[PDB]
Amino acid sequence: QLCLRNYQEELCQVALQGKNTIVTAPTGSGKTVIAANIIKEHFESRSSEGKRFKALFMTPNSMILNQQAASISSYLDHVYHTQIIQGSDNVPTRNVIQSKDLIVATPQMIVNLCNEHRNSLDSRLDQFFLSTFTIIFFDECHNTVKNSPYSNIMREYHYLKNMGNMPEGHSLPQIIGLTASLGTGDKNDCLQVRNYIAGLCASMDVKDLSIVKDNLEELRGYSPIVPDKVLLCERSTDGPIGMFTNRLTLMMQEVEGLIRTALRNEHIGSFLDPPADKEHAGYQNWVCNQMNLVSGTSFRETGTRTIINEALDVLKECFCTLSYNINFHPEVALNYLKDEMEYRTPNFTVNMIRIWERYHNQLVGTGSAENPMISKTVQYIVEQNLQRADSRTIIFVRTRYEATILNKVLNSNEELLMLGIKSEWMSGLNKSTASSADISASKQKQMEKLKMFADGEIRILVSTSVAEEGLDVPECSLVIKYNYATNEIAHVQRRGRGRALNSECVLITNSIALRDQESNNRDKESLMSETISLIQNSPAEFRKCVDEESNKIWPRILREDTDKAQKIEEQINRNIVYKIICKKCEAILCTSKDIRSRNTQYLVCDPGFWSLVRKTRTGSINCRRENCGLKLGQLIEVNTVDLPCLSALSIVLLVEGTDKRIIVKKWKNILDKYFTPTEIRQLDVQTMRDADQ
RNA sequence: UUUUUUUUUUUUUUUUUUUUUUUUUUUUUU
RNA sequence: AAAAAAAAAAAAAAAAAAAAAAAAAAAAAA
Ligand SMILES: Nc1ncnc2c1ncn2[C@@H]1O[C@H](COP(=O)(O)OP(=O)(O)O)[C@@H](O)[C@H]1O
Ligand SMILES: [Mg+2]
Ligand SMILES: [Zn+2]
């Protein structure tokens, strides 16, 4: 058992009244202990009064699910049965919910429950009720905006409260809200922030706020504040870094001129001129927009489109390496450019090959240099190591590739290797980011990385925003934000991540925008503190407008059915065909009648698809057309035979007759706007014949 | 030889959150 | 003409979850 603290007991007293309350406590103050104590008290009261009891615990991140469940079980002395429900587990949910008094499950499963009965063909396996659980908990409730799963659970709770489907004597469940910070959002004055906070609380049917009143000293002592030092490094326009930047701008102008001649050959006078600045995101946005127009238009010459797409891809890569050279030393940017260019080489023309070889020779002759930010970070690391031998440093970066580059830079310095200091490349488990080719993000790998950091083998953690919440990150003695800026909640979580004694938070950047964002975040935090103080001072909130306006639940569904009918009427157009072709090159991949879907995977049963595909080796699908290098999808097997799987992001839909190009981002749009493929039959036969020989 | 359960890896699709940049519209001020 | 605020569209980056499928390794049964 764990002894309750004074502020924890004060927070628990507010929720002990049975009303819906939201608890706002700093990270690491023991929200899990408070939740477990509230659950235990509610269960004891229900047992004393002689009625059924049930508790539901929900967390946005599955990484912290096991730790939270273990802590809850330990606090409850393992007297009540607990079961963890995740996507991997195939155990039925309703049976374990009925047979156990404490259920911990992903909120999406709760959303699916009591809602899957709708739009289901006739039985319907009865209907589940949200009010089955006596007490529910909403960890990290600040994300309950727009159409979040928490918003869906709130809508189900409103269904149960308003509509008269209560079975026998079912009572309204009590929900406790726990979050680090409510979230300013985009409001400016205190009144708007207070109104937004009150509306968010009303969306969860919460009227009372659990805020510490007289135990602030204990909270400050147990959770000391961490100053947020701001450090800025000036940029150097001269030296090897300046020479590298000049060479890359020369490459910018050369590629722009080549694009100009390519457009002139097409006799096209509409394309937008590139921005003068080659380092801002405006150049990348313009490149992406030009690529979108090129995909959405038709060209007289087939090779011109391929050349333009190759130029746009090289421009994007060169912008990425410009950002890398701005953030770090030119060595990593040169290495990234070299590996990307050597990967894309077998699909290039002779002139571009010579241009790249000349530019690479010039960059090799440039030399090397060191960035002031890297030197400052290294000096801070050695200073922390001198202060204590158990120093732990966590570094936040923008992208996963940025994390890998930072880890390589830190591991390449002999000054840290003299004392035996290593680093890692901690990232997130998400695989849908368009940059997952170099990212593994395995669950076991992440657990192993956490274990080695906890054991002390790894000192520097180049971790992304994933580690801010839902991760069992141990105490860190130094938090560094390497050109990374996020919202107020993420900044607060980063500041609170330094649970080690005398933790220091220092921000290192070379851009005025980062400093402005940090100042804005500090101002937002101060405004939140002022609003919280004002709310505490005045107990008469007198806020009920959103609570009464929340009666619009059924009009929402009414308009939902109306515009669903309108979308169905719009979709009624059919019996037409599509000439699906490759995005980069005008090659007939297949026709609209050769695409089939088994469950949710879209496979093309084209006998001639093998002749126009490369079939590399992992397994991947690549265009066989020269100078294309486009990944049309992934190769998968269902009947022990590999079959092609097209991707919407690598194909362009063409309509027969008029030359109207169609761009598709997700398969849902083409599914519900253009056509629907038929169900799969024993069509792997004709595909397997032509797969071999 | 087949079936059931557990673990690891991989793939497709769908539903959300946060940050930055670009563009458009409206209002206010100089 | 310039600046600020609000809404909308596009692009980039990061994070979360769900559904299904495939491969491999173990335990049990036929
Ligand atoms: N009353 C208490 N007695 C002992 N340990 C506590 C107490 N309250 C909190 N802790 C410890 O402090 C930590 C606080 O982190 P926790 O509340 O679990 O996650 P979060 O970061 O969401 O607040 C817990 O891991 C817990 O072990
Ligand atoms: Mg928590
Ligand atoms: Zn192609």
Residue numbers in the entry: 290 to 411, 414 to 560, 579 to 926, 940 to 1015
Provide the publication's sentences verbatim:
While some invertebrate Dicers act alone during antiviral defense, Caenorhabditis elegans Dicer acts in a complex with a dsRNA binding protein called RDE-4, and an RLR ortholog called DRH-1. C. elegans is of keen interest in this regard because its single encoded Dicer functions in complex with an RLR homolog to mediate an antiviral RNAi response. The antiviral complex in C. elegans includes Dicer (DCR-1), the RIG-I ortholog called Dicer-Related Helicase-1 (DRH-1), and a dsRNA binding protein called RNAi deficient-4. Like RIG-I and MDA5, DRH-1 has an N-terminal domain (NTD), a central helicase domain, and a C-terminal regulatory domain (CTD). DRH-1 plays the dominant role in ATP hydrolysis, and like mammalian RLRs, has an N-terminal domain that functions in autoinhibition.
To understand how ATP hydrolysis was coupled to cleavage, we prepared cryo-EM specimens of DCR-1•DRH-1•RDE-4 in the presence of ATP, and added Ca2+ in addition to Mg2+ to inhibit dsRNA cleavage. Under these conditions, we obtained a 2.9 Å reconstruction of the helicase and CTD domains of DRH-1 bound to the middle region of the dsRNA, rather than its terminus, suggesting that DRH-1 hydrolyzes ATP to translocate along dsRNA. Density for DCR-1, RDE-4, and the NTD of DRH-1 was not observed in this reconstruction, presumably due to increased flexibility in the presence of ATP. The reconstruction showed DRH-1 in a closed conformation where Hel1, Hel2, Hel2i, and the CTD were wrapped around the dsRNA to make a network of contacts with both strands. The ATP-binding pocket at the interface of these domains contained density for ADP and Mg2+, stabilized by contacts from well conserved helicase motifs including Q, I, Ia, II, III, Va, and VI. In the Hel1 subdomain, direct binding to ADP-Mg2+ involves residues from motif Q (Q297), motif I (K320 and T321), motif Ia (Q357), and motif II (D430). In Hel2, we also found a conserved loop between motifs IVa and IVb was inserted into the major groove of the dsRNA, with a concomitant widening of the groove. In the CTD, we observed a patch of lysine residues (K987, K988, and K990) that make extensive contact with phosphates in the RNA backbone. We also found that the CTD contains a zinc structural ion that is conserved with RLRs (see arrows pointing up). In the absence of nucleotide or in the presence of ATPγS, our cryo-EM structures show DRH-1 binding to the end of dsRNA, while addition of ATP shows DRH-1 localized to internal regions, consistent with the idea that DRH-1 translocates along dsRNA.
